[PDB]
Structures are given as C-alpha cells and as structure tokens.
C-alpha cells in the first residue's frame, strides 16, 4: 500500500495501529521544481516503538488466552505516523481501502482485509485528522494518548474513544497548584496545535477565575523559525514572572528549551503538562540548569505482567511480522543491517534508550487497555445471548461477519474490569477518568540524569477544592533549592499601607501607598 | 455549503449507519456554485485564456459538515489514490484543483487530505489563522 | 450609525464611571483594573485630571 514500512500480521480480525516511531520528518522545503517525493522521518522514537510492542503484546496475549476470545485470532496492521498528519492520513487511507472502495465502487484486489478497529494516534492534531476520516465509516478509534478537549465532541468525532483523560482536569490541577503555592504572576506557553491551545485556554479561564494574572501568552511550534523563537525568548526574558505554564509536547518544545539553555536563562519554574513532563527530549541532564525543579503531571502507572520479557525478546531476524525491528536494531546499536555491521546477536540490555529503562508504564498501559477494550467488545459480541443483546429485538452480531459499527456500538456500552481490578467504562463523551501523579524534575546523585519523583497526586474523584494534594517536603525547587520561590507581581503591602493602581498593568500588580493621617489599616 | 447542516441521528441500535440527510437550504451557497460555473464557462468561451482547451468541473455539497466534505474529497482524489496507493474502473477523472470549502474546520479537514497529493485548494470563505501554517497545509491557498 | 438601530449616542460600556477630579481610583478586591472606586483625595492633596 502507501507506506512501504509497516508491522503487520494476518488474522481473523485486523486491528489498525498508529504509533510515532519518529519525532518528525526531514525539514525539506520543496520548491516543486520536480515531482514531489515522499519525505523521510529523522529522529527515532523508542517510546513509540515500546508502545507498538505494547499493542503487539496485548494482541498476542489475547490470542493465546482461550478465556477471552476462544476460536478467534486477532491480527494487526500497525503503521508509522512520525508525528505528522500526512503520514497518518496515508496510513488511514490504507486502513479504509475496503470500505471506501465499497462506497465508491471503482470496480481491485477484492481480498484486502477490513480494519475492525484502530488504536488512535498520539498527538491531538493527528488524532483529529485521523478521526475525521475514520468516523466516516464508523470504524472505532481508541486513542491512548490524545487528550485534547476538542475530541470529546461526539457530534464531529462519532467513533472516537480514548483511554486517557482530557486536559480539563489537567488545567484545573495546574490552576490548583498555582493557587496552592500562593502565586499570581505567571506565564503561559502553548504548542501551536490542537493539544496546547485548548488546554492553555482552559487554564487561562480557570486562572482568571482564581484571580491569577498571566503576564504573557505565547505559542510555539516544532517548525518555528529563528525570528519567532527569538521573540518568544525575549518576552520570557523581559517578564518578571518566575513560574511559567507550558502546554506542549516534547518535539514542539525542544527548540525553545534549546534557545533558553543557550541563553542560560535561569530562575524560572516550569509547570509541565503531562505530554512533556516525562519527555526524554527535554529531560536531559545538560538542560538541568534550566529545566531543573520542573513540576509536571503523569498518569497512573499500570501493571502489565510479562511485558518486560516481551520487550527484551525483540530480535530483527526472529520478528517476521514486525518490520520496524530492523531500524530499531540499527538505531540502538549504531550499526547497519545488510557505520559498522550488525552481528545479529547483540544484547539489547546493554544500551540505554527509552525502550527498556522505564520506571512506570503510563501510555503503554493506555495502549494495553485500548487493545483489551476492543477485544472485550469483540468478546461481548461473541458471548451475546440472542433475545437480550444490545441490538434490535435482542439480536446479536454475527461473529463471522462482524462490522466496525457493531464494535463501536458495543464499545459505547462497555463495562469491564482490567487486570489491576479497576472498572473500565467510556462515558457518553467517549473518554475515561483517571488520577494524576505530580512529579518534580530532580538530578540523580549516582547517575547525574533527570529523575522524576512523585511529590503528590491529584484525585479527580474528590470534591472541588480538595482534589490537589502536594507533599512539599519532597520538592526541590529549581532542582536544588528548598524555599518556595516568590512569584507575586509586586510585594505585599504591610499594615498602615494601601494598594495603589498602576495604569495599564493587571490588578495583581500595585504600588504600596501609606494611609493618610486620619486613617489606619490593620491587616 | 448548499445546506446549512444535517439532520439528527445517533445511537445505532443495530441499524447499519446510513447517509444523514441535510436539512436546511442556503441560497448563498448555490450562488457561489453558480459563480464558479459562470467563471468556468466564460473561461471556456474566451479564446484568449487557455486556447484550445475546455475547463471541466466536478462540484459537491459540504452541508457545512466534515463528513460530507470528506466523502466529496475522497471522490476527488480517487485517481491520485489509485496512482499512489496502487489499489479498477480505469476511467477516473483527474481532478487537478479544488476550490476550497467554506468552513474553517471543513477546509482544514479537506486540506489535511488534499495535501497528500499536493492538489491546490483555493478557498474563498475560510479565513482562520490556523490555515496559514504551510508546514501542515502544503497545498492550501486562500 | 444608528447605535441600537434607532439611537444616535455611543453607549456607555465601562465597568465603573469615570472618577471626578477631586477623587482617585480605588481597587476592588477580586475585580479587574477596569473596575475601581472613587475614593476622595485626602486633605492637602489634589488631582486635576
Ligand atoms: C502572592 O499573591 C497572593 C495573592 O494573589 C498572596 O496570597 C494571599 O495570601 C494571604 C496570606 O498568605 C491570604 O490572606 C490571601 O487571601 C491570599 N490572596 C488571595 C487572593 O487569596 C500570596 O501571599 C503572595 N505571595 C507572597 C510571597 O507574597
Ligand atoms: N499531543 C499529544 C502530546 C504527546 C506526545 N507524546 C505524548 C506522550 C504521552 C502523552 C502525551 C503526548 C497528546 O496530547 O497526547
Ligand atoms: N457564513 C459565512 C461563512 C464563513 C466566512 N468566513 C469563514 C471563516 C471560517 C468559517 C466559516 C466562514 C460566509 O458566508 O461567508
Ligand atoms: C524586551 O526587552 C528588550 C531589551 O530591553 C527590548 O529591546 C524589547 O523591545 C522588549 N520587548 C520585546 C517584546 O522583546
Ligand atoms: C549558566 O549559568 C549558571 C548559573 O549559576 C552557571 O553556573 C553556569 O556555569 C552557566 N553556564 C554557561 C555555559 O554559561
Ligand atoms: C459495571 O459493572 C460493575 C459490576 O458489578 C457494576 O458494579 C458497575 O455499576 C457497572 N457500571 C456501569 C456504569 O454500569
Ligand atoms: C485516586 O486517588 C484517590 C485518593 O488518593 C484514591 O482513593 C483512588 O483510589 C484513586 N483512584 C484509583 C483508580 O486508584
Ligand atoms: Ca479466548
Ligand atoms: Ca497594558
Ligand atoms: Ca479558447
Ligand atoms: Ca474575580
């Protein structure tokens, strides 16, 4: 089909997949002198390959276990998006070839398998782009990372479900954190895509609700040129606001953090969104003098029992179905498979790449839960007693001719318990509700790398105003310090003094003016 | 946007999802359609512009909704789809240019699919600042 | 311009009325800068604007 590189395996039911194997594509500005050629992906993403392995492991465990889906095999056709909308659209067009050729009837292999369900993309923009085409045929799409609030609009994204909570709770949690540490002068940075803008707007509204003044609001992108990034760094420099709120992903934030480190801008506290609170692209020790002591967010860790061994068992020659294994081997051992020559028997446990050296599984558990949710919808179809099913007159879908819309209908009314004991249900908005873990960016005393240690949680189930819990004794501000940094716009006025309006400046900033002769102010 | 929207239907209770019916009627949309038709016909009539060649057209209705526009765009790029995906009727017309949709979300959705084949899209009504990012909307004009 | 379709005067859409010459702007807790009070100047002080 379109993408020549893929990881596919035949089966009775085919499940699509869209994982970022690369962080982006080559910056090739085509002048269209000749025929345009397919762009190439540049920076390998080991996190994406681990997510792909998570999906493959879940499918293999489904096939092996006879309790869940007996006498039925699950296949997959997993592709690469490279964090790019065009590549994911090509992969999706590969997914919907059968349905679209049926709808259009161009009269031609007549044997292309039909994709029952698709595990959604990572980025919010790419997920929306894929959903706009997948929901056309009502093929369910269970995303694992896409957390945009725009994707809860079931009017537009009919067949979209996700295993990760949206950014409403994340923005509420960041506002709660800001008001918990007694700050009113902050700054906002957002990625110019469908993920950063809605979250930053929600946080701005909530901060204005809580009387928090935002000094600056700037948008960044992975393809930002020198002038725009220089302007952003200048507005960060001129600002007196210490704490800075960032709603961005790793690749979208890398250029800005590189420029900040090059200018050695220090003294800022970064409130990281979950996207880059654990991004190895920014969580590098050479940046710790700038990004140290960054308070971020992380989802609840899952427990996949045999996942570690399956990750360790990847072999370029023993993985016939996985076509991404060769590039993974080449990029993890810096060798060429026919620049040294790969021996074909090296040990993966020797290299330190974000594929096996993980503390917790957060989005890998989301992928596992997505695959299990699709499998459990299929099983619910399998064990549907006639006369009492979700269909008309209590009828049940035929296993030999399951259609995507039936799987989506069963997914809407799904209620199952995962291996951790929690109940997995998708709301009418199609999303899921989960707790948040608040982490801080420290430095390893024995390794020197960035270490994320938990400083508190954010219980979504609690009542408003009591969700946030912070254990400040475990926090090291700016990576090393202990005192809570000062981030008022202006110093507090003491007794006997009155607030003075500063023209053209937000209400969080004022000048202290002493009370007149006949007047007093106690507090 | 000949129609302003579509009817309401959800909760596919064993009902295989069918095409939704557009509800209202926009006479401005039909005007715009006739504007494009008239321009094409006068270009064909004029011998000065494009000698010895006739400009055809193939126009659909978006109903101000993403799904209808996506179906129209899929019908647009079927020939380039066959060329690229290597997936026939052997008579699919070669659409070389698409006059863009009206809505900004509709234009974004159509452009995310047209930019794969680098088909130019000269919209007339979409005016969001998000469509100026040429890193993503490679073949979108305004 | 017919303002509301019938009128001819520019509507007033400020949070608080302009303070007089003898008064000065005073903040209100929880309100933006466009909303203020009209605290009178103390004795010995003046304001012309
Ligand atoms: C930064 O400004 C905030 C106000 O925006 C200060 O928070 C106030 O703290 C006092 C006592 O700690 C409370 O009585 C007030 O109610 C708080 N303000 C609000 C609006 O609730 C905070 O103390 C300031 N930080 C510093 C270091 O001065
Ligand atoms: N736009 C993506 C950002 C992202 C990239 N990698 C991630 C990993 C985990 C969570 C989020 C991300 C999202 O909201 O999901
Ligand atoms: N009703 C508007 C539609 C429109 C104009 N500009 C837009 C920009 C984005 C989306 C829609 C529009 C019109 O007829 O002109
Ligand atoms: C920021 O400060 C620099 C140096 O003082 C100044 O040149 C610039 O105009 C200021 N504002 C912005 C938006 O850069
Ligand atoms: C950056 O600034 C910090 C501030 O203490 C300093 O320790 C460090 O040496 C500086 N590095 C460079 C490269 O200027
Ligand atoms: C899901 O099933 C469990 C099993 O007892 C039940 O307790 C729970 O209420 C169910 N949830 C919904 C939303 O039906
Ligand atoms: C979320 O946090 C609360 C408070 O710590 C806890 O009671 C609850 O069990 C957590 N949620 C899950 C799914 O464990
Ligand atoms: Ca089974
Ligand atoms: Ca100002
Ligand atoms: Ca002519
Ligand atoms: Ca207020």
UniProtKB/Swiss-Prot annotation, chain A:
The record marks 429 as: Important for ability of agonist AMG 416 to activate G-protein-coupled receptor activity. Changing residue 518 to W: In HHC1; decreased G-protein coupled receptor signaling pathway; does not affect cell membrane localization. Residues 1-523 are extracellular. Phosphate binds at residues 47-51, 362-364. Changing residue 412 to Q: In HHC1; loss-of-function mutation; the quantity of the mutant receptor is higher than that of the wild-type receptor; dose-response curves show that the mutation significantly reduces the sensitivity of the receptor to extracellular calcium concentrations. Expressed in the temporal lobe, frontal lobe, parietal lobe, hippocampus, and cerebellum. Also found in kidney, lung, liver, heart, skeletal muscle, placenta. Changing residue 168 to K: In HYPOC1; increased G-protein coupled receptor signaling pathway. It comes from the Eukaryota. Changing residue 10 to E: In HYPOC1; increased calcium sensitivity. Changing residue 167 to A: Reduced calcium-induced G-protein-coupled receptor activity. L-tryptophan binds at residues 124, 145, 147, 274. Changing residue 429 to S/Y: Abolishes ability of agonist AMG 416 to activate G-protein-coupled receptor activity. Changing residue 274 to K: In HHC1; decreased G-protein coupled receptor signaling pathway. Glycans are attached at residues 71, 238, 264, 347, 393, 415, 435, 488. Homodimer; disulfide-linked. Interacts with VCP. Interacts with ARRB1. Belongs to the G-protein coupled receptor 3 family. It is linked to Hypocalciuric hypercalcemia, familial 1: A form of hypocalciuric hypercalcemia, a disorder of mineral homeostasis that is transmitted as an autosomal dominant trait with a high degree of penetrance. It is characterized biochemically by lifelong elevation of serum calcium concentrations and is associated with inappropriately low urinary calcium excretion and a normal or mildly elevated circulating parathyroid hormone level. Hypermagnesemia is typically present. Affected individuals are usually asymptomatic and the disorder is considered benign. Hyperparathyroidism, neonatal severe: A disorder characterized by severe hypercalcemia, bone demineralization, and failure to thrive usually manifesting in the first 6 months of life. If untreated, NSHPT can be a devastating neurodevelopmental disorder, which in some cases is lethal without parathyroidectomy. This is Extracellular calcium-sensing receptor. It comes from Homo sapiens (Human).
Swiss-Prot record, chain B:
Changing residue 108 to M: In HYPOC1; increased G-protein coupled receptor signaling pathway. Disulfide bonds join 22-63. Changing residue 102 to I: Reduced calcium-induced G-protein-coupled receptor activity. Expressed in the temporal lobe, frontal lobe, parietal lobe, hippocampus, and cerebellum. Also found in kidney, lung, liver, heart, skeletal muscle, placenta. Changing residue 95 to M: In HHC1; decreased G-protein coupled receptor signaling pathway. Changing residue 93 to L: In HYPOC1; increased G-protein coupled receptor signaling pathway; does not affect cell membrane localization. Changing residue 62 to I: In NSHPT; Abolished G-protein coupled receptor activity. Changing residue 142 to Q: In HHC1; decreased G-protein coupled receptor signaling pathway. Ubiquitinated by RNF19A; which induces proteasomal degradation. N-glycosylated. Changing residue 88 to W: In HYPOC1; patients with clinical features of Bartter syndrome. Changing residue 137 to C: In HHC1; although the mutant receptor is expressed normally at the cell surface it is unresponsive with respect to intracellular signaling (MAPK activation) to increases in extracellular calcium concentrations. Ca(2+) binds at residues 43, 46, 49-50, 62, 102, 127. Changing residue 28 to C: In HHC1; does not affect homodimerization; impaired N-glycosylation; impaired cell membrane localization; decreased G-protein coupled receptor signaling pathway. Glycans are attached at residue 52. Phosphate binds at residues 28-32. Changing residue 87 to P: In HYPOC1; shifts the concentration-response curve of calcium ions to the left. Changing residue 43 to M: In HHC1; decreased G-protein coupled receptor signaling pathway. Residues 1-142 are annotated as: Ligand-binding 1 (LB1). Homodimer; disulfide-linked. Interacts with VCP. Interacts with ARRB1. G-protein-coupled receptor that senses changes in the extracellular concentration of calcium ions and plays a key role in maintaining calcium homeostasis. Senses fluctuations in the circulating calcium concentration: activated by elevated circulating calcium, leading to decreased parathyroid hormone (PTH) secretion in parathyroid glands. In kidneys, acts as a key regulator of renal tubular calcium resorption. Ligand binding causes a conformation change that triggers signaling via guanine nucleotide-binding proteins (G-proteins) and modulates the activity of downstream effectors. It is linked to Hypocalciuric hypercalcemia, familial 1: A form of hypocalciuric hypercalcemia, a disorder of mineral homeostasis that is transmitted as an autosomal dominant trait with a high degree of penetrance. It is characterized biochemically by lifelong elevation of serum calcium concentrations and is associated with inappropriately low urinary calcium excretion and a normal or mildly elevated circulating parathyroid hormone level. Hypermagnesemia is typically present. Affected individuals are usually asymptomatic and the disorder is considered benign. It comes from Homo sapiens (Human).
């Amino acid at each position: 089909y379109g993408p020549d590189q893929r990881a596919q395996k035949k089966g009775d039911i085919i499940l699509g997949g869209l994982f970022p194997i690369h962080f982006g594509v080559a910056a090739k500005d085509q002048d269209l002198k000749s025929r345009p050629e397919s762009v190439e992906c540049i920076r390998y993403n080991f996190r994406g390959f681990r997510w792909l392995q998570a999906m493959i492991f879940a499918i293999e465990e489904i096939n092996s276990s006879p309790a869940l889906l007996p006498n039925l095999t699950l296949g997959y056709r997993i592709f690469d998006t490279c964090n790019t909308v065009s590549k994911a659209l090509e992969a999706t067009l590969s997914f919907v070839a059968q349905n679209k050729i049926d709808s259009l009837n161009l009269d031609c292999s007549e044997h292309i398998p039909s994709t029952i369900a698709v595990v959604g993309a990572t980025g919010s923009g790419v997920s929306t782009a894929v959903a706009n085409l997948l929901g056309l045929f009502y093929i369910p799409q269970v995303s694992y990372a896409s957390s945009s609030r725009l994707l809860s609009n079931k009017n537009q994204f009919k067949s979209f479900l996700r295993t990760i909570p949206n950014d409403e709770h994340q923005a509420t949690a960041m506002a709660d954190i800001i008001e918990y540490f007694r700050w009113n002068w902050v700054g906002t940075i957002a990625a110019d895509d469908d993920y950063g803008r809605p979250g930053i707007e929600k946080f701005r509204e909530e901060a204005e609700e809580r009387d928090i003044c935002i000094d600056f609001s700037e948008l960044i992108s992975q393809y930002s040129d020198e002038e725009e990034i220089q302007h952003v760094v200048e507005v960060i420099q001129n600002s007196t606001a210490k704490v800075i709120v960032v709603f961005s992903s790793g690749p979208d934030l890398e250029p800005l953090i590189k420029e900040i480190v090059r200018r050695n801008i220090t003294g800022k506290i970064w409130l990281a969104s979950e996207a880059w609170a654990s991004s190895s692209l920014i969580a590098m020790p050479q940046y710790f003098h700038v990004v140290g002591g960054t308070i971020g967010f992380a989802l609840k860790a899952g427990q996949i029992p045999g996942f570690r061994e399956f990750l360790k068992k990847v072999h370029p020659r023993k993985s016939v179905h996985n076509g991404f294994a060769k590039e993974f081997w080449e990029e993890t051992f810096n060798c060429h498979l026919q620049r040294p020559l790969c021996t074909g028997d090296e040990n993966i446990s020797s290299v330190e790449t974000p594929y096996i050296d993980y503390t917790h599984l957060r989005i890998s558990y989301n992928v596992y839960l997505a695959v299990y949710s699709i499998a459990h919808a299929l099983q619910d179809i399998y064990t549907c007693l006639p006369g009492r099913g979700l269909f008309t007159n209590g009828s049940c879908a035929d296993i030999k001719k399951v259609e995507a819309w039936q799987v989506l209908k069963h997914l809407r009314h799904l209620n199952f318990t995962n291996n951790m004991g929690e109940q997995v249900t998708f709301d009418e908005c199609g999303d899921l509700v989960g707790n948040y873990s608040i982490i801080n960016w420290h430095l390893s005393p024995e390794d020197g790398s960035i270490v994320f240690k938990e400083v508190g949680y954010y219980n979504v189930y609690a009542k408003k105003g009591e969700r946030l819990f912070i254990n400040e004794e475990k926090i090291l501000w700016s990576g090393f310090s202990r005192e809570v940094p000062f981030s008022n716009c202006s110093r507090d006025c003491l007794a006997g003094t009155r607030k003075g309006i500063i023209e053209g400046e937000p209400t969080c900033c004022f000048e202290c003016v002493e009370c007149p002769d006949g007047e007093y102010s106690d507090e």
